[PDB]
Every structure is written in C-alpha cells, then in structure tokens.
Design a protein around this ligand. Structure first.
Ligand SMILES: [Ca+2]
Ligand SMILES: [Ca+2]
Ligand SMILES: [Ca+2]
Ligand SMILES: [Ca+2]
Ligand SMILES: [Ca+2]
Ligand SMILES: [Ca+2]
Ligand code: NA
Ligand code: NA
Length: 353
C-alpha cells in the first residue's frame, strides 16, 4: 500500500507530424483536430526553446484529451506548405481547430489549461436547449459574454435550422440558446421565430429585426454587434480582444470580482457601459487579474499600479504607454459619473473626435 499517484504527464509523444502523406487519414481519425501551423526551426537556441515549449504544451493537452478523440498535429510552413494551402492555414505560429465542416482560428492563450477548456467547449453541441428551470436560470445568469436566444416550433423548424447554422459559425465563443417551450418563451418575452441578442453586461436585449431570420441575417447581425461596450479579457480569446483596439487605444479596467472592492468597481463599470451602450466609439476591457497570474507582475511593473486594488486607465496599444486614474482607497470608489468625467478628460486630450 503506497497510495496511487495523481495522473502525470507520461512523456509519451502523441502530437502528430502532419504531412502530405498522412493528413487525410489524420482528419478521418479525429472528430476534433487542433493543428499548430508553425515556421521551420531557426538556428538560435532561443527560438528552438520557444518551439520546444509550445510543442510540449500540445503534448500535455493531447494526453489529457486522448480518450475524447481530440487529435493534435504540427504543420510546418515549409516542409508542409501544400497541406497548409489545402487546409487554409495562413497565420504564422497559430493554432487552427477543425470540427466537422468548420475551421476555427484560435486566438487565445497558448496554455494547456486554456486549450483543453477550449477544446472541451468545441466538442459540445453548438446550440443549448432550454427546457427546465435550472437551464433557464443558467441562461439568465450569463453576463460576461454575448448570448443569443431564439424561440422555435421544434428542431425541425426551418428557422431553427438556420439558427443552428449560425450558431456553428461562432461556436464555441458565442453561446446560442433555443427553446421550443411556449412557457419558456413567455418568460423570455419571445414570439415564435424571434431571436433576442444580449450584449455582454447588458440587461435589455436587442431583437434581431425582420424575423423569421435567415442564417445570413443572424450572422450579419452578430458580426455587426460583435464588440460589446464592456467586454472581459478571457484567456480563450485574449489576443482577438486586444487586437480589436479603439483607434490605437483601449480603456482598461482591472477588477478582481472575488474582492469586495473589485466587485463594487465592476458594478460601477457595468453602469458606465449601460449608460453609454449606444456609443460605438467606446469599448472598455475588463481584466480580472486572478485570471492571468503570470501577467500580474508584468502589469504592475509596466503600468506602475497595484493590482490588489481596482484600476482604470487608457493604454496605447503601440507602445504600452498608459495613464491610470488616481483613486484613494480610504474613500468610496469613484461614481460612474466620475469615471466618465475622467475618461473624457483623458481622451479629449487625444488625436480623435
Ligand atoms: Ca508536419
Ligand atoms: Ca473555453
Ligand atoms: Ca421580447
Ligand atoms: Ca428575415
Ligand atoms: Ca453597446
Ligand atoms: Ca491565464
Ligand atoms: Na463558450
Ligand atoms: Na476574481
């Protein structure tokens, strides 16, 4: 009796060298396939070590997800240029995820935790059905992401099928929910074939106009409303969010949700968002420092702030130059009006509008 060990990385290689000769068979073997499209090995040790680490991160994810039929592979942009073309791999050192007839160009954190969570989400069906109270309550409780909900006759409705096709386009980043139950639709205030879009952190939805909606109408609407006034930086999508800057800058708020002050600040931020939701020139990024433990020292040093307290600032995406609002913690946090006033002062002395 020694006592069984927790699972451990076993050092067995599972990541596939995907090439011209095997790529068709690889796609046949796995229902979900994650492929790292990468540049060939440079001569310097630094580059080789960076690649070595990325590959092992994939190995860890591959071990974890082996039983679930998720495969992992490498496509060398030189040795495997032809495979890349056929598959549409363009972005250097980027992960592409394949499920059925969909390709996803992953733009999140390169970590085993984040990748595994993402791929488990990918494996799920694209539409969540609401039948019970638990499920409806779960839907109502979602705030930190855009969500859509539609009421349809049944799974065979042409309009449900269009909704599902649209859901697949954004899977798994934007949750699509459906109900076939008139009582549920009643509580959600949905007419038949009506689809309500809830912007992140917004209480009131916007109904997609011109129902019943084609797949294209839904996709167009979501794309047009893709950027919420307040959005959360999430590991699974951090790079896409950060690269979607507001003319060279982001307004960035740090708030630890689990902390009393961080929670209060978040409620204030939500008020600011709600009061300015119609302004297309405004996006605030909420970062919870608890979600990014490896970046906290860097942020505290770079921005010269204490992340144990709520913060709000404006960051220049070009050089990481920034300015942060002074808040005395011996008094109440600034009100929504005060935050808006400060943002106006900072941004009025700028290059636009
Ligand atoms: Ca390869
Ligand atoms: Ca995820
Ligand atoms: Ca309604
Ligand atoms: Ca229509
Ligand atoms: Ca808005
Ligand atoms: Ca993280
Ligand atoms: Na998701
Ligand atoms: Na938190």
């Amino acid at each position: 009796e020694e006592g069984l060990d927790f699972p451990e990385y076993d050092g067995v290689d599972r990541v596939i060298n995907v090439n011209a000769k095997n790529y068709k068979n690889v796609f046949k073997k796995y229902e979900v396939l994650a492929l790292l499209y990468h540049e060939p090995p440079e001569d310097d040790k630094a580059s080789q070590r960076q690649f070595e680490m990325e590959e092992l991160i994939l190995e860890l994810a591959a071990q974890v997800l082996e039983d679930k039929g998720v495969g992992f592979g490498l496509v060398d942009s030189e040795k495997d240029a032809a495979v890349a073309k056929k598959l549409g791999l363009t972005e250097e050192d980027s992960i592409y995820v394949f499920k059925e007839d969909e390709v996803i160009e992953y733009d999140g954190e390169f970590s085993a935790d984040t990748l595994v969570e993402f791929l488990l989400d990918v494996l799920e069906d694209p539409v969540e059905l609401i039948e019970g109270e638990r499920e409806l309550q779960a839907f109502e409780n979602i705030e930190d992401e855009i969500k859509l909900i539609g009421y349809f006759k049944n799974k065979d409705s042409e309009h449900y099928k269009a909704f599902k096709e649209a859901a697949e386009e954004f899977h798994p980043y934007i949750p699509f929910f459906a109900t076939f139950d008139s009582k549920v639709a009643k509580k959600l205030t949905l007419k038949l074939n009506e689809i309500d879009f809830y912007e992140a952190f917004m209480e009131e939805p916007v109904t997609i106009p011109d129902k019943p909606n084609s797949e294209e109408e839904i996709v167009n609407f979501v794309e047009e409303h893709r950027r919420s006034t307040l959005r959360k930086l999430k590991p699974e999508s951090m790079y896409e969010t950060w690269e979607d800057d507001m003319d060279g800058i982001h307004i960035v708020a740090f708030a630890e949700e689990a902390d009393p002050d961080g929670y209060e600040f978040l409620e204030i931020l939500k008020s600011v968002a709600q009061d300015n939701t119609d302004n297309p020139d405004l996006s605030i990024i909420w970062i919870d420092p608890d979600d990014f433990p490896l970046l906290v020292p860097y942020w505290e040093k770079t921005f010269d702030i204490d992340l144990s307290a709520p913060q709000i600032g404006v960051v220049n995406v070009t050089d990481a130059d920034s300015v942060w609002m002074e808040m005395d913690d011996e008094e109440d946090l600034p009100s929504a009006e005060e935050l808006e006033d400060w943002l106006e002062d900072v941004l009025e002395g700028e290059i636009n509008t």
